[PDB]
């Protein structure tokens, strides 16, 4: 795959900021994308986006949709390239 990449803490973690991530994997091992964001005091903060490794949760999910009820940080993962560019939850 390739996924959308975002790191909100890009400077301290010495990574890139925004763009694409090209996923490195293993032989026929599945690859996914993830989106992760906060909802602190009515403002939606983006946390990270990028490649997620073979995860039973993300299986055959086209839309990145978070499922946990009212978590601190929201997380979703999805299958298919760039699928993590858009994220929701419910």
């Amino acid at each position, epitope marked *: 795959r390739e996924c959308i990449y975002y790191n909100a*803490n890009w400077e*301290l*973690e*010495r990574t890139n900021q925004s763009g694409l991530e090209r996923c*490195e994997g*293993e*032989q*026929d*091992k599945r690859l996914h994308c*993830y989106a*992760s964001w906060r909802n602190s005091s009515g403002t939606i903060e983006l*946390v*990270k986006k*990028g*490649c*997620w*490794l*073979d*995860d*039973f*949760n993300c299986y055959d999910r086209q839309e990145c949709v978070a*499922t*946990e009820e009212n*978590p*601190q*940080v*929201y*997380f979703c993962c999805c299958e298919g390239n760039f699928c993590n560019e858009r994220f929701t939850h419910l």
Partner: antibody
């Protein structure tokens, strides 16, 4: 390539606490979970909990619910496990493993909790 | 919900042995997320099969996995002396899913 290396061996006195480290190299640390599993000498594998290094979230084994603390410092790609209010039947080898399939295991950290 | 697998099994070199991992339809019956770890004494577990049946790179094709009903089964073909180890089954751990392991099986390969 993919490799998790753990903190050295710990000897503790009961009631105390221990915190073990897990240093992921060889892949993108925040690209999958870290899992923690311990093993009482001559015995099975026991699952303790999972940490999602991105979200920062944690799930815990009910057995350990409320005295084990799981964390990570993503800026050095290291996950931590802290077991507090130790005992005797806490004496084990402690493992971290990559991702929910546990597809790569650390080398283990022996924690001996003896008076 | 514990996974139960036999205490030990013995094999002769060249033979096939199969270790089984049984739970309820809540878990094993419901999800293709059983995995098999080999563990030589005093060393860390290694992943042999995951996702019921899938094999990582660098894992001998002699190792295969399957599942019928509420039991997943690891099968080691053409036994070798180096196949002698502890074998645990677990399930996927993370997300909606919480971890569990079997008691393990001690596979003895008598030469």
């Amino acid at each position: 390539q993919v490799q998790l290396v753990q903190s050295g061996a710990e000897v503790k006195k009961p009631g105390a606490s221990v915190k073990v480290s897990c240093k992921a190299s060889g892949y993108t640390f925040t690209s999958s979970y870290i899992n923690w599993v311990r093993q009482a000498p001559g015995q099975g594998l026991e699952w303790m909990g999972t940490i999602n290094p991105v979200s920062g979230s944690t799930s815990y084994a009910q057995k350990f619910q409320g005295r084990v603390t799981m964390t990570r410092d993503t800026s050095i790609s290291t996950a931590y496990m802290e077991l507090s209010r130790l005992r005797s039947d806490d004496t084990a080898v402690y493992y971290c493993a990559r991702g929910g399939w546990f597809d790569y295991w650390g080398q283990g950290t022996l924690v001996t909790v003896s008076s | 919900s514990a996974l139960t697998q036999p205490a030990s099994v013995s094999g002769s070199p060249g033979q096939s042995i199969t270790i089984s991992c049984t739970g309820t339809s809540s878990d094993v019956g419901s999800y293709n997320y059983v995995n098999w770890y080999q563990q030589h004494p005093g060393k860390a577990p290694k992943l042999m099969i995951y996702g019921v049946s899938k094999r990582p790179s660098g894992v001998s094709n002699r190792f295969s996995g399957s599942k019928s009903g509420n039991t997943a089964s690891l099968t080691i073909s053409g036994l070798q002396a180096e196949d002698e180890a502890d074998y645990y089954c677990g399930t996927f751990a993370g997300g909606s899913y919480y971890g569990v392991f079997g008691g393990g099986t001690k596979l003895t390969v008598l030469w």
